[PDB]
């Protein structure tokens, strides 16, 4: 008989007593009897005494009030119908469009993936964005560092990513709002809806209007969603490979600090939870590929105080695999996306990964873009025609490069007309190589702007 009664209440932490013959284990779920609030076992205090946290407001509550358990960690609905649906951390609909259709429920927690299941290969995700596709290729089951301020089309880039992964690789998309502000969340919803992509993504937000535990566990919630979809096998096995979008993991670490402090435990070097690395990892290891299916992660990253040596970003980089940065100037230069093709770093940038020729090509592009960047100041100050004509050739060629790296987007089609263009490698590679050969030094920069492959570029150039 699992009914236990409240014994002590402070703030958000909650204490209950039970019988010393039937004691719930840690991370078990407690539903308050007569109300819709839920309690989460944290540490066994002996004497049938348990200290737990609550999930939401704590008002009016009074001691000695009966509470039952579930003898199990938190389980939420999972299934195909979960797309186009916004649920809480508890997987409970907030779209207010009926309950969840599925009856399939899975506990939130599970151990780390087996060493045996780590796929003995490492290959690259295909994307059609023509920039990461050369400079920072993604691994299969990698972590992509993303940086930059708002208003540069973060949502737009996510749109295009989702479109491509669902289209070619039949990927499924899950998004988790950690510490979300409601207004932008609703805007993102409306964008999911107008751009006909909502039907393919599963959405859960944790607002900064909630106690920390909500915000901490939305992460594992979305994670488990992704796990269920991947492990959901396809025909002939081989479940999908899926992408995961998570906002401001730094907020996650902050909420972890929150709950650790509320437990009354001492801080860390800066003052984070001393256990920081534990939860960071527990998040990480369930992000990988397997012999069946794969999972890849996109994570919004914010660096408070610009400290590359702060513990939180330091722990982040311990798992980062590729870095992508967004520019303000580049977007102001009418180039979209505004990915800086000079700071983005990929662990996968090796001739042993993208191949020999691809690697060398990318290195050469990097050299050209650098070379032109230090050229810029002299061009500004000491004029232009006071330099080596080869350097001027470099200038023109780099300008063509920059003009070219932007492209139309299939998501941009509904935005401003101009249907986007999907482009794989082995054409980007060839076109860029030919550009490096200087065989296109007879053409204005315009043919490279807002265009697909080099064949399209030449078509425009002839037509221009």
């Amino acid at each position: 008989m699992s009914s236990g009664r409240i014994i002590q209440i402070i703030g958000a932490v909650i204490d209950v007593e039970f019988e010393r013959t039937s004691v719930p284990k840690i991370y078990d779920a407690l539903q308050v009897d007569g109300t819709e609030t839920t309690l989460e076992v944290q540490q066994q205090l002996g004497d049938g005494v348990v200290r737990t946290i609550a999930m939401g407001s704590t008002e009016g509550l009074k001691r000695g009030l009966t509470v039952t358990s579930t003898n199990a960690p938190i389980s939420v609905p999972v299934g195909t119908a979960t797309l186009g649906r916004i649920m809480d951390v508890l997987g409970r609909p907030i779209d207010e469009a009926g309950p969840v259709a599925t009856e399939e429920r899975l506990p939130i927690h599970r151990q780390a993936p087996s060493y045996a299941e780590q796929a003995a290969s490492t290959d690259l995700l295909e994307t059609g964005i023509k920039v990461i596709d050369l400079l920072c290729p993604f691994a299969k089951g990698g972590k992509v560092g993303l940086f930059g301020g708002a208003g540069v089309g973060k949502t737009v880039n996510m749109m295009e990513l989702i479109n491509n992964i669902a289209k070619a690789h039949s990927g499924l998309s899950v998004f988790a709002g950690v510490g979300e502000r409601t207004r932008e969340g609703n805007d993102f919803y409306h964008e999911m809806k107008d751009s006909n992509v909502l039907d393919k993504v599963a959405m859960v937000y944790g607002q900064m209007n909630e106690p920390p535990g909500n915000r901490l566990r939305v992460a594992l919630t979305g994670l488990t969603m992704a796990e269920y979809f991947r492990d959901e096998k396809d025909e002939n096995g081989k479940g999908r490979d899926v992408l995961l979008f998570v906002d401001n993991i730094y907020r996650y670490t902050l909420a972890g600090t929150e709950v650790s402090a509320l437990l009354g435990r001492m801080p860390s070097a800066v003052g984070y939870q001393p256990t920081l690395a534990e939860e960071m990892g527990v998040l990480q290891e369930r992000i990988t590929s397997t012999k069946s299916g794969s999972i890849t992660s996109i994570q919004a990253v914010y660096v408070p105080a610009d400290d590359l040596t702060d513990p939180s970003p330091a722990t982040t980089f311990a798992h980062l695999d590729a870095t992508v940065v967004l520019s303000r100037d580049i977007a102001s230069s009418g180039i979209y996306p505004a990915i800086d093709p000079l700071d983005s770093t990929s662990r996968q940038l090796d001739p042993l990964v993208v191949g020999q020729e691809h690697y060398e090509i990318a290195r050469a592009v990097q050299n050209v873009l650098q070379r032109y960047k230090e050229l810029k100041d002299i061009i500004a100050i000491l004029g232009m025609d006071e330099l080596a004509e080869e350097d001027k050739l470099v200038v023109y060629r780099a300008r063509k490069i920059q003009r070219f790296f932007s492209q139309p987007f299939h998501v941009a089609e509904v935005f401003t007309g101009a249907p986007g263009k999907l482009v794989p490698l082995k054409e980007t590679i060839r076109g860029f190589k030919g550009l490096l050969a200087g065989e296109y030094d007879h053409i204005p920069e315009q043919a490279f702007y807002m265009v697909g492959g080099i064949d399209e570029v030449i078509a425009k150039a002839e037509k221009l």
Partner: protein
């Protein structure tokens, strides 16, 4: 005369109708408005509590054997042994449009000496933000009478925007002047003052009364001579009054004062509860504390309005715009509390000490102050005409270093520098002198038309004022129509330019 005698007697016979079987407690421990009490086994969390002296208290720590609660009134009147008593209710304060022209306590008790207040409705101070599904986008602008503000930093009805800066920077003035501009907006406004010198409070009161705008306005102040808990809860109460009208489908504006200060008070309170301290003694929930407050203000979906009204109102949508203020130490942004604050607002505005020290009135640094809501919070005409200022101010601020320079530099740089210097000076402005959007419109037009690119910098303000008066007199119907609508049309701009060139042709500055 005998009237009251009958009144008091008839009232009395209505009481002692039965004997209560209430459950209450008694005092065990007292220190600095903090009381440990024994008893009262059953108790709502955060129940408001009554005491034998007529005072009240707020219960926070429900430990397994006793209760800790904070004095709401003034302690130094309580001794162990006296008996507490719960109200069987949660903290609740009154609201109502009758609150306009009234100044009350954080508990909602008049202080204006205007007698009792006939609020037909009271509500619990603590609630939750509506469902995110009941949010619809922001498109209606909010005016400040500040060309820089209204141009580079649009403000939409229901948006959270932060004024921030160092001390004695007119932040209070910024808030109050923004308030003043609501002669025609039809919205209502609430000012929340925290830990202030009653002198300052009364000065603001008197000034507002001079403006007479204390008629669609209500204000509450937790001065520095008040119980810390009062101060801590006050912003929530103000939010409650705002939400009243918001849920009535109405749109309004509210302003906080020194959220840092109330955070300090909360720090002290929590500390006295022997709670585990955090960094800089700050309990972690300060993030939660502020965030659960700010999000309560927004612009709501009219569908939510309709369903709440149960059919009473169907057309409009409610909204509430949040304008908080944070004071900073030497302009730091890395301090824990501001850092928490930043990620919460929809946009932020900084104040730079040097500019006001340089006499730049106002002293806003547009270089970092942003509003990520875009032009959707401007009128069509301002949405059109902002870009010139945007780019000119940009170019200037990259290359303003050449002030003493450009005695040999290329001419285009000189002309652009003069353009920038003039437009920079353009925003210097005095308090209590809001600019109607038409005024801002004529100023920006004259700017982008370069018709001030031929006059000396020292008299730009004079030039502008003269132009202002000239149109105001000559072409009143035009500006009338403009601020009726705020639309950009070729006929409109032609009329404006004709007036400008007339003014230049006519009386000089």
């Amino acid at each position: 005369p005998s009237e009251i005698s009958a009144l008091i007697k008839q009232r009395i016979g209505d009481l002692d109708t039965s004997a209560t079987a209430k459950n209450e407690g008694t005092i065990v421990m007292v220190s600095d408005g903090i009381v440990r009490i024994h008893g009262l086994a059953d108790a709502m969390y955060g129940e408001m509590i009554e005491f034998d002296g007529g005072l009240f208290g707020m219960a926070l720590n429900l430990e397994q054997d006793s209760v800790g609660a904070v004095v709401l009134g003034n302690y130094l009147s309580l001794q162990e042994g006296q008996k507490a008593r719960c109200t069987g209710r949660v903290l609740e304060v009154p609201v109502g449009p009758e609150l306009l022209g009234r100044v009350v306590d954080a508990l909602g008790n008049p202080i204006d000496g205007k007698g009792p207040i006939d609020a037909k409705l009271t509500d619990a101070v603590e609630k939750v933000a509506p469902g995110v599904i009941w949010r619809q986008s922001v498109d209606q602008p909010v005016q400040t009478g500040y060309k820089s503000v209204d141009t580079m930093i649009p403000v939409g009805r229901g948006q959270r925007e932060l004024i921030i800066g160092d001390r004695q920077t007119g932040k209070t003035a910024m808030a109050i002047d923004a308030i003043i501009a609501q002669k025609n907006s039809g919205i209502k406004c609430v000012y929340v003052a925290i830990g202030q010198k009653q002198s300052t409070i009364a000065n603001v009161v008197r000034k507002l009364e001079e403006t007479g705008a204390m008629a669609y306005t209500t204000v509450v102040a937790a001065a520095a001579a008040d119980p810390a808990a009062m101060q801590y809860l006050a912003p929530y109460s103000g939010c409650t009054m705002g939400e009243y009208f918001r849920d009535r489908g109405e749109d309004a504006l509210i302003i906080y004062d020194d959220l840092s200060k109330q955070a300090v008070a909360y720090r002290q309170i929590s500390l006295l509860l022997r709670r585990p301290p955090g960094r800089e003694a700050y309990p972690g929930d300060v993030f939660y504390l502020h965030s659960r407050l700010l999000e309560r203000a927004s612009r709501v979906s009219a569908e939510y309005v309709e369903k709440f009204t149960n059919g009473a109102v169907t057309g409009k949508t409610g909204s509430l715009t949040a304008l908080p203020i944070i004071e900073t130490q030497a302009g730091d942004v890395s301090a824990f509390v501001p850092t928490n604050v930043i990620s919460i607002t929809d946009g932020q505005i900084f104040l730079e000490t040097s500019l006001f020290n340089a006499g730049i009135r106002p002293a806003v640094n547009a270089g970092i102050s942003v509003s990520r809501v875009g032009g959707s919070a401007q009128t069509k005409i301002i949405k059109k005409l902002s870009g010139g200022i945007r780019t000119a101010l940009a170019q200037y601020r990259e290359l303003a270093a050449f002030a003493q320079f450009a005695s040999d530099l290329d001419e285009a740089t000189r002309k652009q520098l003069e353009h920038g210097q003039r437009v920079t000076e353009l925003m210097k402005q005095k308090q209590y002198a809001p600019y109607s959007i038409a005024d801002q419109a004529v100023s920006v037009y004259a700017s982008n038309e370069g018709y001030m690119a031929d006059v000396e910098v020292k008299k730009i303000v004079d030039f502008d004022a003269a132009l202002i008066a000239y149109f105001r007199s000559e072409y009143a119907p035009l500006m009338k129509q403009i601020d009726e609508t705020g639309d950009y049309n070729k006929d409109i701009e032609a009329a404006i330019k004709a007036g400008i060139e007339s003014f230049k042709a006519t009386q000089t500055y």
